[PDB]
Ligand binder design. Sequence first.
Ligand SMILES: NC(=O)C1=CN([C@@H]2O[C@H](COP(=O)(O)OP(=O)(O)OC[C@H]3O[C@@H](n4cnc5c(N)ncnc54)[C@H](OP(=O)(O)O)[C@@H]3O)[C@@H](O)[C@H]2O)C=CC1
Ligand code: SF4
Ligand code: SF4
Ligand code: SF4
Ligand SMILES: [Zn+2]
Lengths: 94, 386, 288, 206, 94, 143, 176, 154, 114
Amino acid sequence: ASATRFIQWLRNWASGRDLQAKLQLRYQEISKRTQPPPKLPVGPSHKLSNNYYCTRDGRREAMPPSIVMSSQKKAVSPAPPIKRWELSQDEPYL
Amino acid sequence: SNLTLNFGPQHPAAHGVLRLVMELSGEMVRKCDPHIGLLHRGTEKLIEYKTYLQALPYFDRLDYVSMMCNEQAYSLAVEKLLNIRPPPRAQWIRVLFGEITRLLNHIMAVTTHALDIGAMTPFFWMFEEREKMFEFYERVSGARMHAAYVRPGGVHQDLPLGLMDDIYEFSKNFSLRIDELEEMLTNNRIWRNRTVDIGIVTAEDALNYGFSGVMLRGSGIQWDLRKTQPYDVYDQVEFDVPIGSRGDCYDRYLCRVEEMRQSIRIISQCLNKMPPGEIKVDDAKVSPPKRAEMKTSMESLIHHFKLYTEGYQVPPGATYTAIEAPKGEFGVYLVSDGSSRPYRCKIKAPGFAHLAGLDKMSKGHMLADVVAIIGTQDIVFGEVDR
Amino acid sequence: LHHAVIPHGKGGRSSVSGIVATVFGATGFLGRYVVNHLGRMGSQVIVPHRCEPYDTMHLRPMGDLGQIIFMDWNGRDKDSIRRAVEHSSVVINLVGREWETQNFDFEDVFVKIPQAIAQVSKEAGVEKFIHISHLNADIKSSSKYLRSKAVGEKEVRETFPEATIIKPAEIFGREDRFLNYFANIKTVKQPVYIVDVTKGIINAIKDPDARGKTFAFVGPSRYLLFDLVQYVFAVAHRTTRDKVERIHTTDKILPHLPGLEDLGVEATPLELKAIEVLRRHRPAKTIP
Amino acid sequence: RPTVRPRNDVAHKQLSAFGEYVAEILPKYVQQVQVSCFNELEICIHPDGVIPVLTFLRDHSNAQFKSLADLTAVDIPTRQNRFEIVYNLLSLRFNSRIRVKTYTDELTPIESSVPVYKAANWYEREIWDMFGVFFANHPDLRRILTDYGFEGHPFRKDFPLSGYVELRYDDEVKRVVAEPVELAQEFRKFDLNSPWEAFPAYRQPP
Amino acid sequence: GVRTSPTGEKVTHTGQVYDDGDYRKVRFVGRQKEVNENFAIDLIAEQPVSQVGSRVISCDGGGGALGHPRVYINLDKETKTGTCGYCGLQFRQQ
Amino acid sequence: LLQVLKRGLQQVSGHGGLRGYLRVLFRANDVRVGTLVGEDKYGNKYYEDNKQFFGRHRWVIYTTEMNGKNTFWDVDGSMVPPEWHRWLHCMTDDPPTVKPPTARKFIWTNHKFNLSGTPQQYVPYSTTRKKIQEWVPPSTPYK
Amino acid sequence: TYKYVNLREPSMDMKSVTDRAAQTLLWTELIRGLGMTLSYLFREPATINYPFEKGPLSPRFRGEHALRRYPSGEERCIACKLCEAVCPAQAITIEAEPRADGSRRTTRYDIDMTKCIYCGFCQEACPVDAIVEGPNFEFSTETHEELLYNKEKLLNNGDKWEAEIAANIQADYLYR
Amino acid sequence: GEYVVAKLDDLINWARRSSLWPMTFGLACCAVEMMHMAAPRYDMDRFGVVFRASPRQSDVMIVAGTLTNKMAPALRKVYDQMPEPRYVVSMGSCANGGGYYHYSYSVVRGCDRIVPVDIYVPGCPPTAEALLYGILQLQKKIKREKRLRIWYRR
Amino acid sequence: TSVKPIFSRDMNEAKRRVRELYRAWYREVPNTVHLFQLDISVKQGRDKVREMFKKNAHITDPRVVDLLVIKGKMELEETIKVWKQRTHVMRFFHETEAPRPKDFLSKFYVGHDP
Ligand SMILES: NC(=O)C1=CN([C@@H]2O[C@H](COP(=O)(O)OP(=O)(O)OC[C@H]3O[C@@H](n4cnc5c(N)ncnc54)[C@H](OP(=O)(O)O)[C@@H]3O)[C@@H](O)[C@H]2O)C=CC1
Ligand code: SF4
Ligand code: SF4
Ligand code: SF4
Ligand SMILES: [Zn+2]
């Protein structure tokens, strides 16, 4: 930011861009290194009632694998064929 | 004859040491035999003596340029066996830092790729940007690299106040930095002479050799796990997948540079769409309670004590979970026996298959084209060797 | 025994050998082999050094963490000898030069310094003392090096009566001044391998009867100096006044003194170890 | 519920139907088919079926599992065939994954799958290196991760964590040497398993 | 309450000190024995007992969430003080 | 360009003459003039210049003597005491002159820099007492 | 959604052909690259004057360990061994016994700083904020043995750095 | 004589510590922070520590990462080919004492079992600033050397 | 007891493959000593080869013999292709490991191991 007006022109012209708008060194735009204290929220299970753990226990709803066949019709694919990707409307060609 | 490429460049480089046994005839490479294992540290056996939390830091040290992406893969695998769901703010944070990590990796991949070829100036310009992104890692986790921030259940801590504005400030100017990198390489006839038509791989050969990531997309294969098999909140962000047309080093180089631009595009959406709420699953049998709860509530203290000693138990089962890591498909085959320590943990490193293809990709090339070909695959022997 | 120095482990790097040794002259040729064998079995080694610490770096990997301790000392300062030997159970003296300097002559390194180490070691309560003299030491010798060895050996025996005195022949090894001496330039020699002498010293520490005795360490074969020197050039694909007089001194025969065999060490023929010593420079008749 | 992973019923039906499809077509080798509660389809096959089953899944029009994502082994010492060989495959056409498992013991060779997937070349070398499972008709089967001359297969459950030998540089012989392992601090084994059952849904019969 | 043994070695708050015949004290020769000199047993005994007017009092060590888990201390015995098992502060019913 | 040269000459005067200018140039390899934020009890001086880019906007000029050591040429980062360490590394915005640390009687009054390689270096040892007490035989030969 | 990174067909009109010929013969695209490195020469460097200037850190920074006290001076650690249990590297070794006043305190508290991964799990597991990773990172040593910390070393680190550790904890404890 | 030797050590110590050319083994993670020390923020070159060197032109070897049994012989050979004076800087927990793989069958428990180490830089990884502190600590160690004073008193 | 074989279908087939391995190892020792510049004699190297084959003489399982031959061939290749360094070839001799007491009294003095 301290560069003279001539040097700013010189490096702007050499690079072809306006480097001063997007300096790669940081000045005052950064956040202050001291911040106000946070007050973080709590999750959905912070209830005093209607909150029995057996109604929200993900681990206990896991099950052993379903056995489709054990040694002890139309053809199917493992899933429907993948849909074709559409070309970008933002910038199709680089 | 027979040569052996040096362990590493004379300049400082961070991707591991390789013993490459080469067969040549004149200037031409007749055979490449990569001798790896020089960084094999028995990570997978060590993980079997750790609880599921204790094993998480082992994943920062695999592809130790894409730290949080490796964490996310392991966290998704454990969350899947636990049958729980991380909270939405955690998912947005994980995608936000997933793309920041993708920038970190692609800077390392592209500028060290140029540095090894001898174009060394862009390395210095772009690791000043990596230094600022290390500051983002250290501000959420206290560590510049091995954060151990993403965990099964969400993230360890919430973003410090003021972090998002600083990430916005960095992202504001980053595209110009990519533009300066392209000014040095993209149209440079010397760079193109070193990369164009080097290490061509056909689409079918790429699939059968087990490639993934840019190694597939450089050959025109329209595959990106963030699009086809989305995880976390990747289905709520807009981005384009770069696709190559010639399957060579130059097309893969352009894909990585364009992926960096799309990462900035995704980061812009994460900053604007970050929702409020908690950061880890509100389930004190998986995620430890807040320190204020641990010091006031009997249930909270018990769960804190047990989570930090025995750890949480994972229902028995096995999953293969993979993500679109910056280096390709990074997966884990995680086997649970019902206890609080994993029974088996195989790590699928994208660079393992890629380095296995070096012999194929280098046929009929010069000794210096092997340098470019290991460069375009972006190999980190931390993940190749485990 | 004191509970700290009871042997423990399987005799490896992390084991406890029970030996606490102060090795004077540890930075030289013989010293580096002694420290290596002491650190191999998990001993506490005190290495007093006169030299720049950079010159002691090759000793650091020779022991587990905390097993090699370095100290500064001066040959003319008894207080720096007391500090070094105070906590040791054996003191080993390997001090010496093959030439005299302005500051130290052979009456210093081979008489005054060994006496001071023995005198202080005795006063401090050290149990075992190992002193290195020379096979050909003799007060009638034309070599002042060998004359001082005779006087020092005699004075060490007075000061520390239970000391174990070892009298090696010329020692050959990778860093010797023997085979490397010939390879760089009437008499019978019986050179002895460096590892044989080192094992002899290490067993003298362990063996109870070794106390108070004098040993002579000699190789298995006697060679005429001419043939030995002839052999070096063939194998190698090819100083001072006092040094020359030692190389021309015939290696004494001392059947009345015990040798390597008595300490359980079998002497290594010079033939099996000449290439090792000499390869970098790129079978003589044995007297019966 | 906010903390519970949602169920995907459509993919569970889809993967079940495809599992029966593969079982009906390959009865010579398929021993079991199951789909987990998080919707991963596993085909358990006799080891003789490695090449036919993997070729069918790669080439068949309704399968098209062109990418071998991973190939690994699991050691379960209590089983007569302690080693479980796991193939994880990816179908880009149908945006689906499948896992194919077989088994072997210490002395029984498995057929190399290099003909089906060139990706398998290094994976099988790693399984040989780390578990000691031999693959028949492998172009170049040798150690890949361990040091030259390394004895044993470290990923076996009965291989000690710190091994049997350790390295150091020895000044006497002027080279790196290998000696029996001694540890200044032994690894501290922890018994962490709670004596109370956690998951009734998985209870084994008495 | 640091003190020296006959050999002149400082005794730690844990009571450690190498005895006379111990060779291991050679590690301190030309160096020093690291000893912390703020003995916690002596500092906590300088704190004045607190007088309260209830049978039960709670201690969190001070600082709210920056202290230790909150515990409740019974003060029925009049022959001794109630001590906090986390921080060692003492209480007496008045 | 004339104003650039003027700023260069104001740095000589800003350092109290040429001797103080050459002093900091050879000690710190830098001649910038900042605002003296404060000084600690060991003689270290702390400066700030918010016009500089982040990371260069704060700096310390180390003291020439600390704890009986000559640090005119031998300075290192471990010489900054903890109260100023927080400010210098931008963990906080307030220097200890504005927000002093809480007083505790066990806190070191005298900061010590890195003592490795000196006779004051830390030497590890086991802090536990002997586990097994041996039997001491009688001193009388009753036998 | 996808895009092509390199699917452009060059224009073959004589003007465009001559434009490419000028680029080949006159090295114009090489001249352009020289401009970019020239523009950097006149930019202000990013270097900071270490050790007189320091890299910016945050209160969460995981540096050298320390054992903390209560304001009374009593040790916070109660020998619960949760840090020893969670340590991913098995870098902590603890022994404990009743103190002479009956207090539950450690007799051994070692951290092998060459085993530690500086992960901060111990300070998360600690229920009383006894063990922390402080802000110090400039503590390299000349010997391996100096990095094997015992309880005296760690307590001294706590007394040494408490002024800054307490402030860092005050600035971040509401995120924990 | 005494005066000259003191000033002569001052000169050569100044020269050797002001021109420390490093060979880095970028073995693993820690090599990334090593690269950040060469990057513009810290610019190790400004201290005289050049960017690239070559083993046979190097003064200091920086072991930056995990050393496995498979790599141990090759690292010792590079150390043996370095011309003297040569120094070794052990960077990070893995090279310091094995770190997080200390109990592995395939990891050397500290590079000081293979080569003598002058400085140990703690961290996993040590920050680029921590490594720079260790490098400047090695310069002070060289500044303390007294090769000619010792030689003159032999 | 009907099992899939590796190479050999019986012990006589296996013994043939064993003898070819011995010939290959026997002939390579003189080259190994020279290429690696070992300080052992060719006779010493060949004695070690005999020692290694000898301690597997009791095996009567053809599958186990095939694995022993398979492993032995891999070791030969590592040596032939110079993938092993000097350190690797010399680990068969344990030069730095002091002799271990074998009798009862010697083991009783040193420690508790049998
Ligand atoms: N090597 C041989 O062929 C034979 C050797 N011996 C005896 O073996 C012993 C050692 O042999 P070797 O190891 O070859 O001798 P070296 O010269 O190789 O090493 C001698 C040791 O003595 C130290 N030293 C020398 N002078 C002094 C002094 N004035 N003050 C303090 N320390 C000093 C040296 O330390 P610094 O490096 O500091 O000088 C060095 O460590 C000697 O006593 C020698 O007489 C006997 C017969 C044969
Ligand atoms: S920071 Fe991590 S590795 Fe280090 S002592 Fe604490 S828990 Fe163990
Ligand atoms: S430091 Fe904390 S977690 Fe560790 S034993 Fe002490 S009180 Fe328990
Ligand atoms: S010390 Fe830490 S950062 Fe360095 S290589 Fe080892 S695990 Fe990676
Ligand atoms: Zn309390």
